[PDB]
Amino acid sequence: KGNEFEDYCLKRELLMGIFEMGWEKPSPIQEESIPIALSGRDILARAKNGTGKSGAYLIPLLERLDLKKDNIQAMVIVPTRELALQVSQICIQVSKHMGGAKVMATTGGTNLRDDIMRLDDTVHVVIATPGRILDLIKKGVAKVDHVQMIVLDEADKLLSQDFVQIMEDIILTLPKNRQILLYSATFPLSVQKFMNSHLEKPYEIN
């Protein structure tokens, strides 16, 4: 076994959401990564650009949430507002039966003012573009002292010269031992460096 969703120790309410996406059986990326991410181990995974592997990290991300705590517990970083919305919609659909999971997308698109206000209400999962979330963190609006997991989706684009420093600053505000799941089409030096610096005994997937 190990190629079926119910073989991964997932909440029944979460399984319902998964299947309602049309995901009957786990893809190879979800099969290899879900059990490992669930165990808490850092991951570096090769995957094509797009929302293809969204489920691979959204499922363990959602499974780990404790909806009894109203603090932001997970973060997903993406390079564009477009991907942020696609991933957020999927996340909202998959967690629809979990009983109150709150997702929030915040990027250069949505005006800052409204997002500040929105962060006054409970938010469990923040999906965002580099600059916007760093801004919200520095302003003290996005409290991330409970972030237990952070995902870098398209790490090569997020670690380009224009964002690398912003990513570095983000990581610095999170709890020291936060779980890091990294997904990227390519593994340039910039990704290798960031990985050596912050990931702990990461499980790799080519």
Q: Does residue 48 have a known ligand-binding role?
A: yes
71 annotated binding-site participant: no
Alpha helices in the chain (DSSP H): 12-19, 28-38, 54-64, 81-94, 112-118, 130-138, 155-158, 164-173, 189-198
Q: 2 labelled as ligand-binding? A: no
Give CA separation, 80 vs 46, 53, 88, 127, 164, in Å: 19, 16, 12, 11, 15
47: annotated binding-site residue? yes
The response to whether 140 counts as a known ligand-binding position is no
Say whether 186 sits in a helix, a strand or coil: coil
Tell me 131's DSSP state.
H
Burial 27-66, CB ≥16 within 10 A → b, else e: eebbbbbbbbbbeebbbbbebebeeebbbbbbbbbbbebe
110 is in an annotated binding site: no
Q: Does the annotation flag 184 for ligand binding?
A: no
Q: Which amino acid is at 59?
A: I
Closest to 159 (Cα-Cα) out of 123, 199, 125: 199
Cα–Cα distance measured from residue 77 to residue 32, given in angstroms and rounded to the nearest whole number? 22
- What's the CA gap between 206 and 202, in Å, rounded? 13
Is 52 within any annotated ligand binding site?
Answer: yes
Annotated binding site: 47-54
Q: Which residues are annotated as a binding site for ATP?
A: 47-54
